[PDB]
Design a protein around this ligand. Structure first.
Ligand SMILES: CC(C)CCC[C@@H](C)[C@H]1CC[C@H]2[C@@H]3CC=C4C[C@@H](OC(=O)CCC(=O)O)CC[C@]4(C)[C@H]3CC[C@]12C
Lengths: 1005, 1005
């Protein structure tokens, strides 16, 4: 109790005295309210965020915009605001020093205002020091200070010119200067400054404008318009889309996730959710503070509706009060929009981010992991993992924040119902429980559902007791609250289902990513580790097996050979020569054994794989061009006859998505790639399996034979031939995975040992008018029913009831049952017409058109002057709708056609992981699979941006029609009953919802 | 009288009544006025504008913008606007059909509106088909129609909600739709449309934005804003300026003038003034219909001010009339500014066109006429004529309208003042005839002249009458009218001097252009018409004379020679060798004879002409250096030693603006040009007179002699040398106007006649502070005088006369004497300061700044609230002045730089007309001059454009401060005297004028 003696010595300034600010015809805050609250509100608002912005901006340095004249003038005007707000204090000090005792308010509040102005100037300077041009806080701070100064200035102007008033002419001039500088600063701070000195734009010529746009453009999503209008005349395709903003790209997002996941693995199992929350979480804190605000505004709307309806029925309420409602509502609605679509977008963006991160991780954990530990089918269990269990993490972004908001709303709505209908909630909750369990007939019952719930609730309310009256207030507030509650009751189902399927997908992603089979960490040293050596093959105590749970198959393997002696391996059918070489690939699990290899080596499988591209690209595999290598790489392989028959020679799309080849052709192209790889020794797996006798002999004598070009290279090959063995000096013979004999062919032949036994054993060497009439009847019946409700809620209150209750309910039920009969009839008619000779699209298009038309006709009926705003809004609506519909199909086709390449590339990489890992080049494929997904995301992002643009435009149109349907019903309150104004005001929210549904569903088909 | 019965049968609805529209406190036009005049005004406007616009656009086709959505929506809105008017007509017909009589006003006013809307739609279609971006008529028509519909709508909304008003709710909704559409079309007509399909844009990358700019942009000069902001940081130079726009280019403007002058000359000698009118007249008429409107608004202003002052004085008048007056004043001032500064641009553009056309015409006329008919010097009368005349025909563009303007202004001001005062203004003119005859004291008296004239007028008015009171109306009216009239009085002089000087210049230009002497029409046979013949020169009975009255000097010239024959012409000094050469080049008049020649002739001028350029550029004369013949002629003419000693070889700057060379070097260069010319007939006139004997003999043996490579061509010689005479095949002896003898050297020697005689006879082998204090004293004295006059004009009237006045006049005179003493003292102080150690610039900077500060505090201490408006006008004005000065000084320096080159090129061409015509090349230099003039005017145009930009931005600010001074002094009319309000309103126009003076003069520093 100090404010009375704080502001004036005696005390005659009761703060918020309702006898001056509310009840009069000239509302005005008390002098002390103006001096204290209207000054401290903006200062406290700015001081609250200064911590947060100093914490956030010091981590996001972007540029050094140096000395733009806007910065100079803003700093100068901030200093001028300081000097005036300090001169006010100095004049107060001079007055108190040599004059009348002065209240402490005049000696305290200007000090705080001056301090706030200094902080604003310093924040502008620091905001310039960092690379942010258009402030998102300076605009709002100046706006709030300007609103408060506007209130104070209105009070001062009204107080001035009453009659010869004796006023202090120092706190007038100074305040006018302060308000003028406030307006100047607010207008000035709406412009974007220069670009940062060293911006990210160095080579990209088409960057997305979101990284550099004014605050209003970001709020209203105005930077998409550039490609929407441009997307109307010339069809959109490919390169017209922008480039990503360097923070959604895969090469920037993925490393954070992979390092966090590997740190979590080291710390240990708990799922990656526990890290998935801590990597993309801090971007959700802005998706939770932007849902509570919109949620509060959604409920705060109908309270303003109730206040307006109560005021209308007050014939003695002061006029201006009405306006004070009809503005506030508008503003509130607008804020809700400018918050709701600032949440969705953020959420949506984060969801898209999730995708790339997972796509970055699974790929990077697929081509360098799980050596033979991959028992899930390559098709339908790994690429399908990517597709399904990563496309499910963009919906969970949208459906996660509802798990707390959707229930809350419900109960809060129910709470308000209790506060509205009181004991009638006992029947209202019963009717809602009846409606909870509640095809064309089904859809039309859903259409009539608002009528059904209204009829049931009103009937039970009027029949439970004779002590309750159905005035406009309770009826229309209940209608609005039911319309609000409808959406969460529809959203509560399938949200739990989405959470469940996302949990299943999370389990699958964990069970894949938690393989952790880092088998090729290091099992042997670098093959060609020393540049100089003598022995090619050396081995001792070699033990190798397919997996951990298999008995050993290789024991007592100990032999060696220098460089220069032709060596080949001979094994019986099923003896394990293929598995032996597979173990020799250094791609298996080793218990013990010492093996030495020397020389650069590449790989050639016995099951050749073809990358889906041209023959030339398959041969290149990274190199630019070396002409002699190509001219000498085809004659040796004898690919001239094979290249000539090809439809396009060395240009056709070989392999899959092209002309098929024989197995020998795949073998030949693999050998050509291998000999292009430029190694010193090579690995081959019987490449001449299907080659003809003459062709095989020619190929062997061309290169592989002693006269071949690669005779300078020691020979490492496998085969099961017989005529190819005698030319080999020493034959490596495996007997049950163990060496048989070592020595030259002459020595073993003279020995007459195992080889002699092998040779001896083998010895191989009327309705359209009806539909229109029924539609018109149904819609005019609905409009007449609403008009009848408006008339009924205006009945006089005599004898504790209305003028007559039974007849009103009887006729209400009568035309409701008539409407039900009509809807059943035209449902049957339209179903028969569709079956006898897509129909749903036309039905809902006509329904929504007629609903919007009926709402407009109701608005016109209430106040004819409303016809002022029906044309200009409608045109605007059209000039949005068309555009979006003409620029959302293309942005959907691009995104849908760009999705397949990433999955096809992942399947390609998964099929031939052995070959790419063998060639010691696994980084180009990562770049390719990152670029493809980056292109897909670059195509996908403008789709959601345009969706937000369209939604904001439609919401603004709906808010404008709300405001201009309340204005004309407040101006003419003296000739319109409460029912008319209540119905007209309640219909505009449904106008907004109908417009949004019509745009989203009807024309998009 | 017929209109009264038109409104209604009973005449209960008049067309006007002061008791319903002006007397009450709720003004509203009567029913008939709203239904007839407000509905016919825009329609009459458009129907009157239609024929002139159609005729103007019939000859200004620019493109075929086909089907832009803007055109489609505008056409749809036009059709839907016509349909509502036809609906009104049909409703009136249906109502009158059954049983109702409704008067014919409802059958005519909606009848013609449909026609007007259909005409608007057709005009939009035609404008689209004729390639106009933003309409200049449609926007104004929509604005006028919207104003009328706004008045009608306000009347309708006020009438409807009065008390149980039974209004037919069919015309109301129709009119609401009509108003809505009008608003939509007005806001849509501010959008620029697509560019025309085909235009001049095929190579120009930097076009002027004037050709493609919205109507609300060319009115306010908004594009120069782009070039002006860029000029603040980076300097403006060279290619930064915009290229011209096909209308100011010299290539297309000169042909019209030259063709029309040729036609005028062929008619007859009337001056080119007559053809100047018909060539550059049609564009100047728009500068006539604009000056009158500004002259009318400038006087409509003071009457509005007087009405506002009278309303402020009266207390029983309603409170809305003052707002009407203060809005009309602002609208009138804004329209006056726009009209005046759109007239000035037209005037200056016409002046620029005159200059370029005259320059081009003079250049084209100069270089191929007046052969040997020039008695004046080549310098000081042609190039001086060019420069001075062309630069004197731009100021006449601005000064020509003053001769018709002055009367309208002076007689109208005299009329208004006489209607105000009468005999008092008779004494007024008796006092103005004191300043009619009308140095620091002189400047100060000039500054104080309005105060002195007001003091004298008021003193005489109150002394000679003593029965008329100094009111508030007549006084401030007199001040405003005198301020208006001051400028034309000073501007009328120097106009007649400008006209006299321009007449002198026009006469001298006419006499230069009429010096048409095309002597070389045709005299001899065509030299190179064919390409065959054996006789080189065939001349018989040739007579040539220098002048018309001079006796003939050549007679009996009859000789001939075949091709490839050596001829030498030998004659004594004064025999006529120079005249023979002049006649042989075919540039002198012939009376009789037959002369024919075949083949291209080598021109050997002993006089040297060199243009300041690179040496090689002079060498080529426009050709290339592909052929190696240049090296051959360098070697043959022994030019290698000449080239070696050059500072940079063939790159050193030869000719003027460079190094100097001897006569022999220039002769050798000219001989090189002659051998580059590729001639067939070779003539020689002692070109080696200044060359050394050995060098001359070597060059003679090189090229001139029979041993030269050009020996296969005819050679004819003339000189006084004796060494080369024995080696010539044939000799012509020229003496006494006749050929003495004809024959070969052997036969002439055998004759022993003239040749023998020639051989025998002719053969050889404290101050700062004092000034500040005095300035402050003078300004506070002026402020005290202003306060005293404000008090004096508010004195009560008792017993016929007013309060004590003689003491007020005495103290006013004492204050004037003190002000004179102060100005004398500080003029002495400033003179002492200047003589002890631009000063006028600083003096009047002080004066303007102090006066604007004093006026700002004067408006401050009349309405304190007005302090809200000082910051956001001072900041805007300061920024505009800074931008203008910074971006205008640079491109004024550009014009200073780019003025000399055109005159230098003209002198260069004039001094070498002989050579440039001898070798038949007179087209490249025309293009060079056109390019130079085009560059100069391209750099000069933005100067006037930016001047208009600054002026508009300053006049708009002045109008805004005038409005806010005339508004804040009406809201509180009760507590202000008439004198204070009149002073505050009257001082704002002087504030605007002082602002313009300050910016221009005291910022061009
Ligand atoms: C109490 C009475 C005297 C009325 C108050 C009026 C003046 C004290 C103030 C009001 C607004 C002020 C102006 C507000 C903004 C500016 C911009 C400012 O521009 C700069 O200096 C920025 C560029 C730079 O610093 O180079 C120059 C001073 C000026 C004109 C100020 C000059 C002083 C003004 C006219």
């Amino acid at each position: 109790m100090a404010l009375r003696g704080f502001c004036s010595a005696d005390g005659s300034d009761p703060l918020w005295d309702w006898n001056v600010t509310w009840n009069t015809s000239n509302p005005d805050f008390t002098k002390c309210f103006q001096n204290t609250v209207l000054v401290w509100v903006p200062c406290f608002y700015l001081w609250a965020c200064f911590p947060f912005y100093f914490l956030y901006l010091s981590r996001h340095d972007r540029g050094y915009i140096q000395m733009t004249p806007l910065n100079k003038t803003k700093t100068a005007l901030g200093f001028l605001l300081w000097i005036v707000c300090w001169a006010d204090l100095f004049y107060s000090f001079w007055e108190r020093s040599r004059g009348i005792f002065l209240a402490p308010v005049f000696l305290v509040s200007p000090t705080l205002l001056g301090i706030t102005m200094l902080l604003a100037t310093f924040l502008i300077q620091l905001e310039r020091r960092k690379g942010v041009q258009s402030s998102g806080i300076m605009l709002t701070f100046w706006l709030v200070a300007l609103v408060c100064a506007l209130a104070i200035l209105r009070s001062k102007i009204m107080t001035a010119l009453k009659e010869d008033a004796q006023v202090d002419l120092f706190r007038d001039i100074t305040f006018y200067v302060y308000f003028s500088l406030l307006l100047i600063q607010l207008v000035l701070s709406c412009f974007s400054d220069r670009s940062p000195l060293f911006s990210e734009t160095i080579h990209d010529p088409n960057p997305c404008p979101e990284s550099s746009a004014s605050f209003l453009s970001r709020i209203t999503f105005w930077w998409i318009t550039g490609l929407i209008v441009r997307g109307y005349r010339q069809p959109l395709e490919g390169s017209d889309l922008w480039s990503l903003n360097k923070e959604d790209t895969s090469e920037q997002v993925v490393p954070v996730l992979v390092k966090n996941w590997k740190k979590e693995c080291a710390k240990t199992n708990p799922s990656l959710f526990k890290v998935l929350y801590k990597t993309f979480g801090p971007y959700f804190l802005m998706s939770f503070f932007f849902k509570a605000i919109h949620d509060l505004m959604m409920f705060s709307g109908p309270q303003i509706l109730k206040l307006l309806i109560k005021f209308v029925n007050d014939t003695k309420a002061p006029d201006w009060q009405g306006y004070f409602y009809t503005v506030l509502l508008f503003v509130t609605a607008c804020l809700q929009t400018l918050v709701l679509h600032q949440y969705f977008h953020i959420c949506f963006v984060s969801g898209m981010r999730i995708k790339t991160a997972v796509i970055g991780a699974v790929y990077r954990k697929a081509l360098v992991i799980t050596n033979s530990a991959r028992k899930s089918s390559t098709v339908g269990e790994i690429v399908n993992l990517m597709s399904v269990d990563a496309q499910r993490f963009m919906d969970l972004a949208t459906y996660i924040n509802m798990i707390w908001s959707a229930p809350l709303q419900v109960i809060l709505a129910l709470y308000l119902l209790w506060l509205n209908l009181g004991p009638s909630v006992l029947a209202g909750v019963a009717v809602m429980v009846l409606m909870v369990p509640v095809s064309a007939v089904g859809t039309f019952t859903w259409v009539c559902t608002p009528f059904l719930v209204a009829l049931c609730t009103f009937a039970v309310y009027v029949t439970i007791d004779e002590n309750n009256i159905l005035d406009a207030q309770t009826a229309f507030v209940s209608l609005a609250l039911f319309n609000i509650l409808r959406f969460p009751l529809n959203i509560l189902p399938m949200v739990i289902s989405s959470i469940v399927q996302a949990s299943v997908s999370l389990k699958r992603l964990r069970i894949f990513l938690s393989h952790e089979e880092l088998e090729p960490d290091s099992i042997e040293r670098r093959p060609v580790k020393d540049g100089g050596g003598t022995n090619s093959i050396t081995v001792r105590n070699a033990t190798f097996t397919w997996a951990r749970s298999d008995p050993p198959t290789l024991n007592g393997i100990t032999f060696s050979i220098p460089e220069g002696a032709l060596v080949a391996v001979v094994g019986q059918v099923g003896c394990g020569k293929s598995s032996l070489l597979s173990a020799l690939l250094a791609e298996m699990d080793k218990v013990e054994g010492h093996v030495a290899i020397k020389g650069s080596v590449a790989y050639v499988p016995q099951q050749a794989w073809i990358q889906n591209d041209s023959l030339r690209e398959n041969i290149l595999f990274g190199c630019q061009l070396e002409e002699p290598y190509y001219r000498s790489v085809i004659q040796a392989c004898a690919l001239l006859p094979d290249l000539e028959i090809l439809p396009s020679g060395d240009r056709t799309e070989i392999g899959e998505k092209g002309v098929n080849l024989s197995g020998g052709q795949k073998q030949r192209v693999s050998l050509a790639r291998a000999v292009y790889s430029n190694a010193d020794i090579y690995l081959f797996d019987d490449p001449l399996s299907a080659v003809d006798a003459h062709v095989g002999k020619h190929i062997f004598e061309n290169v592989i034979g002693p006269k071949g070009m690669l005779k300078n290279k020691t020979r490492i090959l496998v085969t099961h031939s017989m005529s190819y063995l005698p030319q080999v000096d020493v034959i490596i013979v495996m007997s049950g995975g163990k060496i048989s004999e070592m020595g030259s062919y002459q020595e073993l032949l003279a020995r007459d040992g195992a080889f002699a036994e092998f040779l001896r054993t083998y010895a191989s060497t009327f309705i359209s008018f009806l539909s229109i009439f029924l539609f018109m009847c149904n819609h005019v019946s609905a409009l007449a029913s609403n008009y009848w409700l408006s008339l009924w809620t205006d009945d006089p209150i005599v004898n504790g009831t209305q003028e007559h209750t039974k007849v009103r309910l009887s006729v209400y039920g009568a035309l409701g049952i008539s409407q039900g009969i009509a809807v059943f009839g035209y449902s049957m008619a339209v179903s028969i017409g569709g079956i006898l000779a897509i129909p749903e699209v036309i039905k809902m298009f006509m329904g929504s058109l007629f609903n919007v038309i009926g709402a407009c006709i109701v608005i016109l009926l209430a106040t004819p002057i409303a016809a002022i705003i029906i044309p200009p809004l409608g045109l605007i609506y059209f000039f949005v709708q068309r555009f979006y519909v003409a620029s959302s199909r293309q942005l959907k086709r691009l995104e849908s056609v760009s999705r397949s390449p990433v999955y096809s590339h992942f399947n390609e990489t998964l099929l031939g992981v052995s070959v790419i890992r063998a060639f010691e080049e696994q980084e180009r494929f990562i770049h390719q699979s990152d670029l493809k997904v980056d292109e897909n995301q670059k195509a996908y992002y403008p789709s959601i941006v345009a969706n937000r643009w369209l939604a904001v435009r439609l919401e603004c149109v709906g808010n404008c029609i709300v405001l201009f349907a309340a204005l004309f019903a407040v101006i003419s309150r003296h000739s319109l009953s409460a029912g008319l104004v209540g119905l007209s005001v309640s219909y505009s929210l449904q106008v907004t919802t109908y417009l949004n549904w019509l745009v989203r569903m009807s024309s998009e088909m």
